[PDB]
Paper text:
One of the most abundant salivary proteins in Aedes aegypti mosquitoes is a high molecular weight (>300 kDa) protein called salivary gland surface protein 1 (SGS1); it is thought to have been acquired via horizontal transfer from bacterial endosymbionts. SGS1 is exclusively expressed in the salivary glands of adult female mosquitoes, which suggests that SGS1 is involved in blood-feeding and pathogen transmission. Here, we determine the native structure of SGS1 by the cryoID approach, showing that the 3364 amino-acid protein has a Tc toxin-like Rhs/YD shell, four receptor domains, and a set of C-terminal daisy-chained helices.
The SGS1 structure is cocoon shaped, with dimensions of 210 Å × 115 Å × 86 Å. It is organized into 6 domains: two β-propeller domains, a rearrangement hotspot/tyrosine-aspartate (Rhs/YD)-repeats domain, a carbohydrate-binding module (CBM), a lectin carbohydrate-recognition domain (lectin-CRD), and a wedge domain. The C-terminal moiety, a ~230 aa-long sequence previously predicted to form a set of TM helices, is surprisingly almost fully buried within the chamber inside the cocoon shell and forms daisy-chained helices, which extend across the entire internal space to an opening at the middle of the Rhs/YD-repeats domain. DALI search of the Rhs/YD-repeats domain identified two top-ranking folds: Tc toxin and teneurin. Side-by-side comparison of these structures revealed that the SGS1 Rhs/YD-repeats domain is nearly identical to that in the BC components of bacterial Tc toxins and highly similar to that of eukaryotic teneurins, though the latter has a much shorter N-terminal β-sheet (cyan in Fig. 2b). Sequence alignment indicated that SGS proteins and Tc toxin contain all three residues required for catalysis (one Arg followed by two catalytic Asp), but teneurin lacks the last catalytic Asp, suggesting that SGS proteins are likely the AP with the corresponding auto-cleavage site located between residues 2733-2734 in SGS1. These observations suggest that a major conformational change must occur in SGS1 to activate its catalytic activity during its secretion from the gland to saliva. The exterior surface of the SGS1 Rhs/YD shell is decorated by five domains: β-propeller 1 (residues 1–344), β-propeller 2 (residues 705–1216), a carbohydrate-binding module (CBM: residues 1345–1494), a lectin carbohydrate-recognition domain (lectin-CRD: residues 1575-1715), and a wedge domain (residues 2225–2304, 2326–2465).
Numbering used by the authors:
A (entry chain A): 2942 to 2955, 2967 to 2990, 3029 to 3042
B (entry chain A): 1 to 433
C (entry chain A): 1443 to 2767
Write the structure that this text describes.
């Protein structure tokens, strides 16, 4: 049980020192995910809410 | 929505309900479906009740079967001023008989009917038109019609029947009017076809209606000449004109998703609202349910805590103001049910959490009652007894030479943030002075 | 300024204005930060930090004097502090909100006695507490006035106060338990008074004084006072100094106040409300001797443990509930050690319970009517200094050591091959147990206690030998199932393999050097999945291989700057894709062609600090479609609010949790009942198990009144005993009744009672030591609590297309004439036509018999029913015989080994007689097997039935008495003449088998009548029956049947998958084809053309029914829980749309169902919203359309009854392996899909989603591979899975929290240190 998801927590499954360029690529991954992430009427609201 | 006002129980039992199905009918007449002594068929047994005294008159074992068969219908009628019932026996023979006697009428035809794994099958029913009873029926091959001249000398005469339905299913359009029917229907999932029933019964004249995806478990007709249509999909309302195919509107109320199987659709009937409008009532999964026929459809389901809520409703129900009267059979008992139609009200609630917010204000006012102390004032005396571990005194003895040897710390302070201090004391037996 | 807390404000400056353009190189920029007061007044700054906005901040501070980590700083901006003792022990922790997590204390060695002569006591003691609302007072001159009402002058320092006069608390506690702890310093005659409720504690420098007595104390010690309405208990310096009873009323508006005469300085002050306390007295090895929990206001729970002269555990009592309200005034030792808890304690004398057997006296013998003198479970050890089990005895006289159902183990096994292949006394310890059912089980163990092989055999079933081979680091490199050994040896001799080989049956793993983790996991049914790691040992890729050793699909993981996982995707295998994996393992970048990819953004860019590192925002993207959901974790990752965010509206569909002590105390549903929000309040008691579920009702005056939903009653052992549905007008109780060993026997209520038998009555098996359920017997009496018109059996229930309408009437009348129906429509007993000698030949026709009996069992509602079970070698359920009638008292016996020693022939005559008869009867033919040449007589209606009057006229006579032709032709008159012509010919041609001819008349007098009873009624012939005749050593049943539906399964060569399925007597071959990873993609016996799975959740995505009649489309979250279902029609129009709002565990809470009855005109739908109320054992009920329905559950958690206002509105009956026998309910609003074991039953396709796996009740086998390997085969199912019967996430959870607090106490105390034991088995040699 963790806030952050472990590799084994997913359902797909069947650090002494770090170089500069590795930090830059990790930052690129973080910025990429940050750029990606960003009575019938109630039935319409919730059906748009669950999946679109 | 419907509120049960009162339940009145009849004074006579109906016996055990094992393997029996109910069919209750009030006296049918040419002039109208007037209130009269009701005749029930329970099992193979026909019983007479009078609504005045609400007591059983007689019980004659007339019938041959208990399950209301599609091949053995029965009804009451009045003909010649004399009330009769008339049913179908196991030999295909009509058993016409007045209330007390059993005058076997002459018959020009004896239907033979048999059941198939292919589901399309022979059925016969008793319909009324023009004051005369028609025993109409489809045998294995096609559909033909008959009518009783009466008892005595009367004999079934057969009018001309043309159709041979490719896809065969026979329900009669049932309506609350002086005649038992006006039309007769042959239903398929692609379209229904319908034939007018006249002084000669079945005519050639046919009035196909378009209704798709619907196997048409029931068909109803109004005195206002709009055609109801109960289907597993729902209820589709049609208007009968020179062409009956015009589609009025649809409501999903009487449907399979609503729980309306075969046994619940068979009960629904019509009754006048009072203002020359008609509404349809019948028992279902939730119980007796009643709906006015209107563009905006709104049913009313009985919501009450009783035992006679789920009752097979007799035809010919009545409405008087906002009150309705229905006759029902529950668990082999007869109950007259008085109940009221209630339009649902529910005052809306708003302003749940509008509460006036504001900013958060913080200012540090130190209390004048409480004073910060200058310099320390107390130094607790730690006890070496609690801090001294006992792991040094558990396995002391050396195995090799049989001596004992142990080391314990005399001072050991590592609560320092600086460099820790430890001074250790050792015991080891030796021969040196 | 972003947030504030008490007197302190948090201020931050995000420099988000400019960043590097492309991040090829570094900017090398300068930061100058200035902290200044903009006015004349001073500012007080505690800590300053500078970082990038991403990096997770866990700055920690240490105490300048005592040198321990006393406060940490989370990223979100809040501080969580630890509180330390005088000897640097971690006694408490404080959460971010200010309410403490736990408190701990122990017996101090200063308050001890040098010389003492006692017979019973604890060497040391520990006390642990967890409280609802509980604050530590730092005597800050800025916040004390808002916290305390001060009347006198006082002088303070950080966490210390030299006070004079009195101070009162402003909180005004109103709860069951109140308690406070503090540290003082007493000088001269300066005296301190602590008033809680009515009780004032007066501590002096010499002695602490209470109203009853005064106890000696040192002048400086830790003081703990625990008060309930009936209790007071005062610890000083860890030793319980006083304890006294109280007659005070309930606590309401009680105030804690301190009043001091003279100078005293109190160091720490910790005030706890609704504090749940536990005391543990420990022996010389710091092992618990006696535990005392506080259960409730004036109710404690005691358990005592015994230890040997060497130090090993011998016996342990069960939890018992002692009440303090009726303490009888003999003594009062509610938390002190109970000398008289067990009188048979001393080994020397007084009839020690190891020798004699029963204990003589408890304090409150709440167990003696249940456990009949033996509440303890004990263990007897072999003659060894180590702990090797010889005989272990459970509570109960029958289950004790002296009892019959005792577990006995042997180190030496009788089998030569186990002793000669595993070298005895060379680090291979073997234990062997034998059950009276004719089964033995042996397990062989490594040095490091990992089983290397286990073997088990049973009577008449072949032996089972499974083996596991491990590595140098202890990792399991290989395992071999029993199919391998059965194929190889194929005899009694076995050779348990010791080394890793290549074999298609083996499950192999190949970990890297120094045992990193699996690099190739290979199974026979699936394939070889290989793991690819990074330079920093991050799990980067995971490739799957087909059976032709070619790649299938590659799962890729992308990682953040933090080192946590950024996103996860799956891409199809390709040479360019494999080369891209090879390159990107070095480049650290992403795979380019990601079609579906789930992104995880735990909040770190949010401008609201309280969210940062606390939310979990998930974006799930499967091709075009998307799904966003974010949930709020508080401290220690407990969910406080789950939201389903969509871009169209700023508001979020959310369900809010209010929880303390890691237990959910309230739920705020997104549901509206009676136009108001549904708020559920769960009330727990002092033990933390659930005691009530209620719903909030708001009143216009400004108050909320709770309407109870269910009041739950528990036992002393944590078992739930009585659920009391007290909501609405009709309130009723469901009581669970238990017995001596701890099993559940009765589930009793006014609607439907259940009885379970464990030792008394079985089918053919004796009581197995496993404690498996041998018989379940129901008694339904709800048949007058419902719409009774739907109950009676009619004659149309028997008719359908296949049978004629007229024959149904005659067959139903014949059925009623024999008393099969008791004039109500409820079947009286099972329809066995071979028992009824006189019946119509239309009924006695075989296929008509099957259909008539099946429909009589399905549409009928019998008053009594049940099953009697029989189990196999793998622990699975191989047989179950039903008793739908009054048969429950006198069932038959299994045909095999029937007791014809009672027949009148000798044992040597019986053995040859049974060998000949068992070789000459084909039992499945029934009584036909008694006669010769029955194949030639099947041509005719008379010839198919004549074997019964011929049998009856053989020995019994009477019956028809040569005039039976007229009773046979009930439905015809002509057929009687043909009967009379063919009767004498069929009567004369029927000649008996030579075996029974060779017997003699004084045997045949009566024996053949009961022989016909067993051969007619045997396990094939009820419509309620599950069986599995032949079974692979891996537990794959080669034929299984349910009712009259018989599936004969032939399995693939080297796998556990199904090769072919035969549907029954027709033997028409329906096909079933799996995938490369083992999951079934098509099973035409369920009329499924194709199953499409989800690449991300590995669950079902698209189910296609046969001839394209229906289509089910599923969508999920990342957890694999179902989010929404869409059922389409033949014309690709949506018929039903279902939406689930899932709890974290997987439970559903709110469900929106919109069903369109006319697909074309969707403007007029049917809309229904339901909300489920879950409990300990299962869902208690559901609100649906302003209406609440109760749900009544049986054992194992299946849904038996659905009740509305005291009326049964739905009812379902099940048979084992999950297939439903029958259903009562006709109202569609009343039905729920939870069905068997509370697992959603897909009504359209007939498949349960049994814990994120499809299941087929007709086959009794899972459709997907088992993620956690439970059996030798992945797809095997047990047959029945009972519930824990213990309140989960209540009693068990908090008991585990008590144990981990004990663990941290022992760790700081030095219990887990080098050579810290008085037992040479635990010494450091
Ligand atoms: C008529 O019906 C009654 C129950 O209403 C039943 O008891 C009786 O046996 C039936 N037969 C006659 C002839 O009364």
């Amino acid at each position: 049980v963790y806030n952050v998801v472990k590799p084994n927590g997913l359902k797909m499954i069947w650090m002494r020192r770090v170089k500069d360029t590795i930090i830059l690529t990790w930052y690129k991954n973080g910025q990429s995910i940050s750029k990606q992430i960003l009575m019938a009427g109630l039935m319409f609201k919730k059906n748009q809410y669950f999946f679109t | 929505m419907l509120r049960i006002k009162e339940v009145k129980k009849y004074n006579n039992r109906l016996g055990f309900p094992a393997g029996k199905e109910v069919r209750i009918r009030p006296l049918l007449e040419a002039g109208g479906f007037a209130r009269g002594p009701i005749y029930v068929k329970y099992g193979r047994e026909l019983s007479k009740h009078d609504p005045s005294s609400r007591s059983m008159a007689w019980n004659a074992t007339v019938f041959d079967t208990a399950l209301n068969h599609p091949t053995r219908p029965w009804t009451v009628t009045v003909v010649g001023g004399k009330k009769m019932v008339l049913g179908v026996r196991k030999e295909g023979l009509g058993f016409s008989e007045d209330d007390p006697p059993r005058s076997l009428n002459v018959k020009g035809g004896d239907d033979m009917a048999d059941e198939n794994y292919g589901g399309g099958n022979s059925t016969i029913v008793l319909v009324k038109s023009g004051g005369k009873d028609f025993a109409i029926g489809l045998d294995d091959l096609k559909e033909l019609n008959s009518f009783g001249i009466g008892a005595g000398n009367g004999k079934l005469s057969l009018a001309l029947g043309n159709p041979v339905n490719v896809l065969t299913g026979v329900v009669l359009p049932v309506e609350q009017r002086d005649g038992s029917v006006a039309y007769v229907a042959v239903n398929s999932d692609t379209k229904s076809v319908i034939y007018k029933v006249d002084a000669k019964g079945l005519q050639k004249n046919q009035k196909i209606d378009v209704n798709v995806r619907a196997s048409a478990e029931k068909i109803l007709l109004t005195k206002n000449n709009e055609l109801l249509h109960i289907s597993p999909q729902g209820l589709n309302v049609y208007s009968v004109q020179g062409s009956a195919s015009t589609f009025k509107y649809f409501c999903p109320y009487f449907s399979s998703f609503g729980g309306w199987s075969r046994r619940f659709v068979d009960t629904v009937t019509l009754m006048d609202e009072g203002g020359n409008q008609e509404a349809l009532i019948g028992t279902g999964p939730k119980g007796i349910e009643y709906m006015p026929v209107d563009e905006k459809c709104k049913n009313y389901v009985v919501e009450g805590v009783q035992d006679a809520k789920h009752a097979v409703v007799a035809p010919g129900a009545t409405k008087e103001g906002n009150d309705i009267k229905v006759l029902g059979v529950y668990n082999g008992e007869l109950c007259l049910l008085t109940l009221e139609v209630v339009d649902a009200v529910e005052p809306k609630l708003d302003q749940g959490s509008p509460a006036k917010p504001s900013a958060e204000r913080v200012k540090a006012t130190k209390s004048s009652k409480v004073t910060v102390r200058s310099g320390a004032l107390s130094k607790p005396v730690s006890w070496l007894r609690d801090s001294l571990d006992e792991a040094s005194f558990k396995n002391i003895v050396d195995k090799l030479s049989g001596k004992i040897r142990f080391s314990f710390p005399l001072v050991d302070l590592q609560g320092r943030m600086g460099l820790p201090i430890k001074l250790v004391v050792y015991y080891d037996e030796s021969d040196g002075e | 300024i972003k947030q504030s807390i008490d007197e302190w404000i948090y201020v931050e400056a995000d420099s988000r204005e400019i960043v590097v353009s492309e991040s090829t190189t570094v900017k090398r920029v300068l930061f100058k930060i200035i902290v200044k007061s903009t006015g004349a007044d001073d500012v007080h700054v505690d800590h300053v930090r500078l970082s990038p906005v991403n990096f997770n901040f866990e700055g920690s501070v240490y105490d300048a004097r005592i040198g321990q980590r006393t406060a940490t700083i989370q990223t979100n901006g809040f501080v969580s502090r630890r509180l330390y003792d005088a000897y640097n022990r971690r006694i408490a922790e404080v959460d971010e909100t200010g309410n403490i997590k736990y408190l701990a204390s122990y017996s101090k060695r200063v308050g001890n006695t040098k010389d003492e002569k006692k017979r019973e006591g604890g060497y040391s003691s520990r006390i642990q507490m967890r409280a609802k609302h509980s604050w530590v007072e730092s005597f800050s001159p800025y916040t004390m006035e808002k916290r305390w009402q001060i009347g006198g002058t006082a002088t303070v320092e950080p966490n210390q106060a030299i006070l004079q006069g009195q101070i009162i608390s402003k909180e005004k506690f109103s709860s069951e338990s109140i308690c406070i702890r503090l540290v003082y310093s007493m000088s001269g005659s300066s005296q301190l008074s602590l008033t809680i409720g009515k009780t004032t504690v007066v501590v002096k420098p010499n002695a602490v004084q209470y109203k009853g007595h005064t106890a000696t104390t040192p002048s400086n010690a830790e003081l703990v006072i625990f008060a309930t309405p009936k209790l007071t208990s005062i610890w000083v310096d860890g030793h319980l100094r006083i304890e006294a009873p109280e007659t005070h009323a309930k606590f309401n508006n009680e105030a804690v106040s301190l009043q001091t005469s003279g100078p005293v300085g109190i160091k720490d002050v910790i005030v706890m409300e609704d504090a749940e306390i536990q005391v543990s007295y420990l022996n010389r090895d710091s092992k618990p001797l006696q535990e005392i929990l506080l259960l409730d206001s004036s109710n404690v729970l005691i358990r005592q443990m015994m230890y040997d002269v060497i130090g090993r555990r011998v016996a342990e009592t069960v939890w018992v509930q002692k009440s303090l309200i009726d303490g009888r005034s003999t003594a009062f030792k509610a938390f002190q050690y109970h000398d008289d808890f067990v009188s048979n304690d001393n080994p020397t004398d007084r009839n020690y319970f190891l020798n004699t057997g029963p204990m003589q006296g408890y304090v409150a013998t709440a167990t003696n009517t249940i456990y009949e003198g033996y509440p303890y479970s004990q263990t007897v050890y072999y003659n060894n200094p180590l702990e090797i089990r010889h005989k272990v005895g459970h509570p109960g006289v029958k289950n004790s050591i002296k009892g019959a159902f005792v577990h006995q183990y042997a180190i030496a096994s009788d089998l030569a091959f186990i002793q000669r292949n595993y070298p005895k006394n060379e680090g291979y310890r073997q234990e062997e147990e034998k059950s009276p059912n004719g089964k033995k089980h042996v397990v062989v163990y490594n040095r490091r206690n990992k089983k290397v092989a286990e073997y088990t055999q049973v009577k008449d079933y072949n032996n089972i030998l499974t083996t596991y081979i491990y590595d140098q680091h202890g990792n399991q490199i290989q395992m071999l199932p029993p199919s391998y050994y059965h194929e190889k040896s194929r005899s009694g001799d076995y050779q348990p393999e010791k080394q890793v080989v290549a074999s298609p049956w083996a499950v192999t793993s190949k970990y890297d050097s120094t045992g990193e983790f699996i690099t190739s996991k290979e199974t026979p049914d699936g394939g070889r999945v290989e793991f690819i790691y990074n330079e920093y040992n991050q799990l980067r890729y995971q490739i799957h291989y087909k059976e032709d050793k070619q790649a299938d699909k590659i799962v890729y993981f992308l990682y953040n700057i933090f080192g946590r996982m950024c996103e996860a995707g799956q891409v199809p295998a390709n040479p360019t894709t494999l080369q891209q994996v090879r390159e990107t393992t070095k480049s650290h970048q992403a795979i380019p062609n990601r079609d579906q990819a789930v992104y995880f953004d735990y909040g770190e860019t949010e401008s609201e600090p309280s969210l940062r590192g606390r939310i979990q925002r998930t974006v799930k993207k499967n091709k075009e479609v998307l799904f966003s959901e974010v949930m709020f974790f508080d401290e220690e990752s407990n969910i406080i609010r789950k939201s389903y965010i969509s871009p169209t509206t700023n508001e979020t569909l959310s369900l809010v949790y209010l929880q303390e002590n890691d237990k959910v105390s309230g739920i705020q549903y997104p549901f509206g009942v009676d136009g108001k929000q549904l708020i559920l309040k769960y009330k727990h008691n002092l033990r933390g198990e659930i005691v009530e579920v209620a719903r909030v009702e708001q009143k216009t005056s400004g108050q909320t009144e709770f309407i109870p939903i269910a009041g739950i009653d528990h036992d002393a052992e944590g078992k739930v005993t009585k659920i009391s549905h007290n909501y609405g007008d009709s309130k009723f109780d469901q009581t669970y009744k238990y017995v001596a060993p701890g099993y559940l026997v009765e589930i009793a209520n006014n609607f439907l009672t259940e009885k379970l038998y464990y030792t008394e009555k079985g089918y053919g098996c004796e009581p197995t030591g496993d404690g498996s359920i041998l018989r379940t017997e129901f008694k339904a009496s709800w048949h007058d609590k419902c719409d009774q018109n739907l109950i009676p059996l009619t004659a149309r229930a028997f008719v359908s297309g296949g049978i004629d309408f007229t024959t149904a009437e005659t067959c139903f009348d014949a059925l009623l004439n024999l008393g099969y129906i008791d004039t109500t429509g409820r079947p009286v007993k099972t329809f066995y036509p071979d028992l009824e000698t006189g019946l119509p030949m239309k009924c006695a026709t075989p296929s008509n018999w099957r259909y008539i009996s099946e429909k009589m069992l399905e549409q009928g509602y019998p008053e009594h029913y049940g099953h009697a079970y029989d189990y196999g070698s793998h622990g699975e359920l191989i047989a179950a015989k039903s008793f739908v009638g009054k048969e429950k008292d006198s069932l038959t016996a299994p045909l095999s080994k029937a007791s014809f020693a009672n027949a009148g022939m000798k044992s040597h005559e019986l053995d040859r007689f049974w060998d000949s008869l068992s070789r000459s009867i084909n039992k499945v033919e029934g009584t036909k097997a008694i006669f010769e040449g029955t194949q030639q007589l099947t041509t005719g209606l008379v010839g198919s039935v004549i074997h019964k009057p011929k049998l009856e006229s053989l020995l019994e006579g009477k019956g028809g008495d040569s005039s039976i032709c007229t009773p046979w032709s009930s439905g015809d008159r002509t057929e009687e003449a043909k009967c009379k012509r063919e009767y004498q010919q069929a009567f004369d041609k029927l000649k008996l088998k030579q075996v029974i001819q060779s017997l003699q008349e004084p045997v045949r007098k009566n024996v053949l009548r009961i022989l016909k009873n067993t051969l007619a009624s045997m396990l094939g012939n009820s419509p309620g029956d599950v069986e599995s005749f032949s079974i692979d050593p891996n537990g794959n049943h080669g034929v299984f049947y349910t009712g009259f539906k018989r599936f004969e399964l032939k399995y693939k060569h080297q796998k556990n998958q199904i090769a072919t399925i035969k549907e029954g007597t027709k033997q028409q071959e329906k096909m079933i084809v799996h995938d490369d990873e083992g999951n079934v993609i098509k099973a035409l016996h369920k009329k499924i053309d194709k199953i499409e799975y989800d690449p991300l959740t590995q669950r079902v995505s698209r189910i296609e029914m046969s001839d394209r009649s229906r289509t089910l489309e599923f969508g999920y979250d990342f957890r694999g829980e179902r989010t929404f279902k869409r059922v389409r029609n033949k014309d690709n129009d949506i018929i039903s749309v279902n939406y689930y709002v899932r709890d974290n565990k997987g439970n559903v809470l709110v469900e929106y169902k919109q069903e369109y009855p006319n697909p074309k005109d969707t403007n007029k739908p049917i809309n229904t919203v339901t909300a489920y109320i879950h409990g300990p054992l299962g869902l208690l009920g559901f609100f649906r359309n302003n209406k609440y329905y109760n749900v009544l559950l049986d054992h194992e958690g299946s849904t038996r009854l659905v009740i509305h206002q005291g009326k049964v509105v739905a009812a379902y009956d099940y048979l084992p392996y999950g297939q439903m026998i029958r259903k009562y309910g006709s109202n569609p609003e009343a039905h729920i899909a939870f069905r068997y074991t509370g697992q959603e039953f897909d009504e359209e396709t007939g498949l349960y989603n049994y814990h994120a796996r499809l299941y087929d009740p007709d086959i009794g086998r899972f459709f997907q591979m088992d993620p956690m390997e439970q059996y030798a085969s992945p797809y095997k199912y047990a047959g029945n899975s009972p519930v824990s019967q213990i309140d989960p996430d209540g009693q068990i959870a908090v008991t585990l929290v008590l144990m981990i607090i004990g663990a941290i106490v022992g760790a700081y105390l030095g219990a887990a240190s080098a050579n810290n034991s008085w037992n040479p088995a635990k010494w450091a040699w």
